[PDB]
């Protein structure tokens, strides 16, 4: 089994995914502003 | 029929201006038959006189271009012309001449290389290398002039002395430059179906890593050729300015289109995070590291 | 006997070439070499066998190119009105003078053969070819397009080509800086031709719009252009409307 | 279990890279 | 590679020696033989060493040449060193 540690593993992964969902959506909004012109 | 030297009709700034693809159909002056001459000394002197012009890439009365050489084709010009020796020459003189003919091939190939690769579209690295080739040719003609002077005034001069002198003086540097040039021609014609010169020199330098003179020459050539790239890198790291518009440098700053100027001015984050890139093709192994 | 003597009976061809070669190199007619078709081709005579003719074809490249450059210099000496092209012609004349002096040196030292002549003048291949290429486009290119065309060669990697390009660019660009000097200091416009990024409109009937900028024509080597324009406009306003000549 | 989160992370890495490449393509073509 | 470099230098010297021997127009075969005689040991040694340039590895070649530096013959030890 994977070692347990004081730092929350799933919390770190979840925060990475949320930060990857902000970058994606901001990039999509920028591309929409770029394409429509 | 009269003979004329007429003017031929990213611009090629060093391409030959006059026509040079003219190949004479028959000799303007009919010389003595080689079979008719039986003495060895006469044959040796005649072949020496014809060889002095051959070493510069010109035809002679007894050394003629092979029918395979087509001046129209670029690769044929770059690789240099192949020569055929008249069948009536003496066997020993024919062998010695066949060894020396290769020097005319290299010289003609380099001379035609300069008139092709020395323009803006091939970048600063290739241009600076063409500078080295042109300086080497200037040096080589001083080896040919001394040979001509000795042929004219020295009684003891003979074919073997010419072979030994040329092989021991200029063979090594000429071989290096010709091999690098032809390899560049092969790679550039493959890519059509810049900074790659440093890769070719480094690849070439592995085989001569134990040879002192060849390694010294290759290291000197690499040092002078790379100086432009070091200038670009130094300006980039000291003042944050890219200067040379040939897109040679690895750090590719790109211009925003006029149609999107107002958009990118508002969102400067994407301007400063997307329109600076690293051109991975032109990177050396030193910079082949993510953190660097 | 030397090698060159034993071959003499068996090899026929016209030192005599070197006697009449200097006159041909300076772009002048010769007893054995004659120009034709407005000095665009040179006829190599009979009694010059294959090898010597092939070698001369390389040497004669300098003669024809120099003749073309001399024709251009003599023709456009004082006809062109644009200052940029005039400065270009001035530097071209200086380069041709240096070339003539070099030829005189090469033939003052009595040469032994054609090859020493060729080697002596060899370093002039790139300079002559570059000058001929640039002068070939002195007509279609305008005053400013010519300046931008030369400026692009200052970045050439070849030390010889970039050396001549940056040598000519200094004198070619001096007149542009003189226009900028007159505009900056006194506040007046000199260029009668369209070769500057500031212009006037006589048809306009109000000060603020008689003078307008041309953002497309701003050169790359100029800095703080949007401040040059304001300095010049305010100078005109001060010395022609407020009539404050003292300050 | 966390294998699934890692898999989604790498999928979004690829999607972000694709979006950036789309921006570069569009800008290159407009120029 | 360094071995080949020194071999090329030696061959160049040999060619120059031959050119000297025949520039001085010789009278007979024996004077030619005597003039080039001192090159018997050098050529034989170089041919023997180069004959084993394939099977011998990079370090075994170095050790093989090094064993000849102790040769008592001034000519053979001179070329070996």
What does residue E46 show for φ and ψ, rounded to 5 degrees? -65, -40
Q: Which residues of B touch E16 (CB under 8 A)?
A: 164
CB B269 within 8 A of CB B235: no
According to DSSP, residue D2 is labeled: T
- The count of CB pairs under 8 A between chains A and D is 35
Tell me if D23 and B274 make a contact (CB, 8 A cut-off).
yes
Tell me if E2 and B164 make a contact (CB, 8 A cut-off).
no
**Measured distance CA(B149)–CA(E57) in Å, rounded:** 48
Q: Which residues of D touch A27 (CB under 8 A)?
A: 16, 19-20, 23
Written as one string, the DSSP assignment of A1-37 is: -PPP-SS-HHHHHHHHHHHHHHHHHHHHHHHHHHHT-
Sign of CA dihedral B74, B76, B80, B85: negative
- Any idea which residue has 């972000």 for tokens? D16
Question: Given CB atoms, is B116 within the 8 Å cutoff of chain C?
Answer: no
**Measured distance CA(B10)–CA(B119) in Å, rounded:** 7
Tell me if C157 and B6 make a contact (CB, 8 A cut-off).
no
Question: Given CB atoms, is B155 within the 8 Å cutoff of chain E?
Answer: no
Please tell me which residue of chain B has the smallest CA distance to C160: B131
Tell me if A37 and B267 make a contact (CB, 8 A cut-off).
no
Which one, of B220, B216, B246, B222, lies nearest residue B232 by Cα? Answer: B246
- Any idea which residue has 């005689």 for tokens? E37
Q: How far is CA C227 from CA A22, C103, C223, C233, in A?
A: 43, 50, 9, 10
**C17: how many CB neighbours lie within 10 A of its CB?**
18
Q: Where are the alpha helices (DSSP H) in chain B?
A: 40-54, 74-79, 91-117, 123-153, 159-169, 171-191, 197-205, 212-239, 261-266, 268-274
For an interface test with E, give the residue of B204, B211, B214, B216 to mutate (most E CBs within 10 A).
B211
**Measured distance CA(C63)–CA(C57) in Å, rounded:** 10
Q: Which residues of A touch D6 (CB under 8 A)?
A: 13
Tell me if D16 and A21 make a contact (CB, 8 A cut-off).
no
**Measured distance CA(C125)–CA(C61) in Å, rounded:** 9
**C25: how many CB neighbours lie within 10 A of its CB?**
24
**Measured distance CA(C121)–CA(C119) in Å, rounded:** 6
Q: Where are the alpha helices (DSSP H) in chain E?
A: 2-23, 29-36, 40-50, 58-66, 74-80
Touching status, chains D and E (3+ beta-carbon pairs under 8 Å): no
CB E22 within 8 A of CB B158: no
Which tokens go with C212? Answer: 């307008």
Q: How far is CA B60 from CA B20, B57, B95, C49, in A?
A: 16, 10, 17, 9
Written as one string, the DSSP assignment of C34-51 is: EEETTTTEEEE-SS--HH
Task: Report the gap between the CA of A15 and the closest CA in chain B (Å).
Answer: 22
**Measured distance CA(A14)–CA(C137) in Å, rounded:** 66
Element (H, E) at B83: strand B83-85
Task: Report the gap between the CA of A16 and the closest CA in chain B (Å).
Answer: 20
Nearest to C60 among B5, B37, B53 (CB): B5
Helix (H, G, I), strand (E, B) or coil at B281: helix
Q: Given its phi and psi angles, is residue B113 left (phi above 0), alpha (psi -120 to 50 degrees) or beta? A: alpha
**Measured distance CA(E80)–CA(E7) in Å, rounded:** 11
Please tell me which residue of chain B has the smallest CA distance to E15: B164
* Method in brief: cryo-EM
Touching status, chains C and E (3+ beta-carbon pairs under 8 Å): no
Nearest to D15 among A17, A24, A34 (CB): A24
For an interface test with D, give the residue of A20, A22, A28, A32 to mutate (most D CBs within 10 A).
A20
- Say which residues have a Cβ less than 8 Å from residue B246's Cβ, sequence separation at least 6: B120, B121, B123, B124, B194, C155
Element (H, E) at B251: strand B251-253
Q: Which residues of C133-148 are buried (b: 16+ CB within 10 A; e: fewer)?
A: bbbeebeebebbebbe
Tell me if A30 and B260 make a contact (CB, 8 A cut-off).
no
Written as one string, the DSSP assignment of chain C is: --HHHHTGGG-----HHHHHHHHHHTT---SS-EEETTTTEEEE-SS--HHHHHHHHHHHHHHHHHHHHHHHHHHSSS----HHHHHHHHHHHHHHHHHHHHHHHHHHS--SSHHHHHHHHGGGHHHHHHHHHHHTTTTTS-HHHHHHHHHGGGG-S-HHHHHHHHHHHHHHHHHHHHHHHHHHHT-----SSS-SSEEE-TT--SHHHHEEE-GGG--TT---HHHHHHHHHHHHHHHHTS-----
Helix (H, G, I), strand (E, B) or coil at B132: helix
Q: β-strands B63-65, C41-44: how paired?
A: unpaired
Tell me if B270 and A33 make a contact (CB, 8 A cut-off).
no
Please tell me which residue of chain C has the smallest CA distance to B130: C158
Question: Given CB atoms, is B147 within the 8 Å cutoff of chain C?
Answer: no
Nearest to A37 among B263, B267, B270 (CB): B263
**B271: how many CB neighbours lie within 10 A of its CB?**
15
Q: Which residues of B touch C165 (CB under 8 A)?
A: none
Please tell me which residue of chain A has the smallest CA distance to D10: A17
| C-to-N gaps above 2.5 Å in chain C, after residues | 14
CB E69 within 8 A of CB E77: yes
Nearest to B255 among D20, D23, D31 (CB): D31
Which tokens go with B22? Answer: 């003219």
Task: Report the gap between the CA of A17 and the closest CA in chain D (Å).
Answer: 6
Tell me if B260 and D30 make a contact (CB, 8 A cut-off).
yes
Element (H, E) at E24: none
Q: Which residues of B4-22 are buried (b: 16+ CB within 10 A; e: fewer)?
A: ebebeeeeebbebbbebee
Tell me if B257 and D27 make a contact (CB, 8 A cut-off).
yes
Tell me if B259 and D31 make a contact (CB, 8 A cut-off).
no
- Enter the resolution in angstroms: 8.2
What does residue B149 show for φ and ψ, rounded to 5 degrees? -65, -45
Which tokens go with B144? Answer: 């040919």
Question: Given CB atoms, is B59 within the 8 Å cutoff of chain C?
Answer: yes
Task: Report the gap between the CA of A28 and the closest CA in chain D (Å).
Answer: 8
């Amino acid at each position: 089994n994977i070692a347990t540690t004081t730092k929350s593993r799933e919390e770190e992964l979840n925060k990475r995914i949320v930060n990857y969902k902000i970058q994606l959506k901001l990039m999509k909004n920028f591309l929409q502003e770029l394409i429509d012109r | 029929s009269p003979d004329y030297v007429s003017l031929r009709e990213n611009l090629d700034i060093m391409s030959s201006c006059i026509v040079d693809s003219v190949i004479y159909k028959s000799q303007k002056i009919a010389g003595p038959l080689l079979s008719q001459i039986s003495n060895l000394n006469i044959q040796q002197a005649l072949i020496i006189r014809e060889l002095l012009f051959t070493l510069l890439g010109h035809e002679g009365h007894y050394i003629q271009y092979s029918k395979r050489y087509d001046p129209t084709s670029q690769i044929s010009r770059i690789e240099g012309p192949d020569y055929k020796i008249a069948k009536n020459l003496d066997i020993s003189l024919k062998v010695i001449t066949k060894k020396l003919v290769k020097f005319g091939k290299f010289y003609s190939g380099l001379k035609s290389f300069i008139q092709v690769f020395d323009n803006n579209k091939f970048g600063k690295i290739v241009q600076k290398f063409c500078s080295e080739v042109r300086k080497f040719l200037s040096s080589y003609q001083q080896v040919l002039i001394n040979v001509e002077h000795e042929f004219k005034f020295n009684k003891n001069f003979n074919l073997n002395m010419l072979d030994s002198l040329l092989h021991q003086e200029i063979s090594n540097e000429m071989t290096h430059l010709y091999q690098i040039g032809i390899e560049i021609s092969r790679i550039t014609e493959e890519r059509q179906k810049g900074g790659l010169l440093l890769q070719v020199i480094q690849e070439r330098m592995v085989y001569y890593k134990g040879d002192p003179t060849s390694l010294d020459f290759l290291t000197q050539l690499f040092d002078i050729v790379s100086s432009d790239y070091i200038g670009m890198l130094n300006q980039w790291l000291l003042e944050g300015v890219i200067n040379d518009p040939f897109d040679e440098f690895m750090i590719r700053e790109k211009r925003v289109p006029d149609s999107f100027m107002e958009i990118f001015q508002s969102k400067s984050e994407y301007y400063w995070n997307e329109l600076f890139l690293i051109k991975i093709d032109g990177l050396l192994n030193q910079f082949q590291n993510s953190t660097i | 006997l030397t090698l060159s003597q034993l071959i003499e009976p068996y090899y026929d061809t016209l030192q005599t070439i070197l006697t009449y070669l200097p006159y041909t190199m300076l772009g002048s007619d010769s007893k054995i070499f004659t120009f034709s078709n407005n000095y665009t081709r040179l006829e190599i005579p009979k009694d010059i066998n294959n090898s010597f003719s092939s070698l001369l074809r390389e040497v004669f490249e300098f003669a024809i190119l120099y003749k073309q450059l001399a024709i251009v210099v003599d023709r456009y000496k004082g006809t062109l009105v644009s200052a940029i092209k005039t400065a270009y012609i001035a530097i071209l004349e200086a380069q041709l003078n240096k070339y003539v002096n070099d030829i005189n040196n090469i033939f003052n030292n009595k040469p032994n053969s054609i090859l020493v002549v060729y080697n002596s003048i060899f370093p002039w291949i790139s300079i002559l070819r570059f000058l001929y290429r640039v002068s070939n486009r002195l007509n279609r290119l305008d005053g400013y397009e010519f300046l931008t065309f030369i400026y692009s060669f200052t970045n050439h990697g070849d030390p010889k080509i970039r050396g001549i390009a940056v040598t000519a660019f200094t004198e070619v660009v001096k007149p542009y800086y003189n226009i900028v000097e007159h505009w900056i200091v006194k506040g007046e416009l000199i260029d009668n031709n369209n070769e500057f990024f500031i212009i006037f409109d006589q048809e306009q009937n109000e000060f603020n719009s008689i003078i307008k900028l041309l953002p497309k024509k701003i050169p790359a080597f100029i800095k703080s252009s949007d401040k040059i324009f304001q300095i010049g406009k305010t100078l005109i306003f001060l010395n022609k409307y407020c009539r404050e000549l003292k300050w």
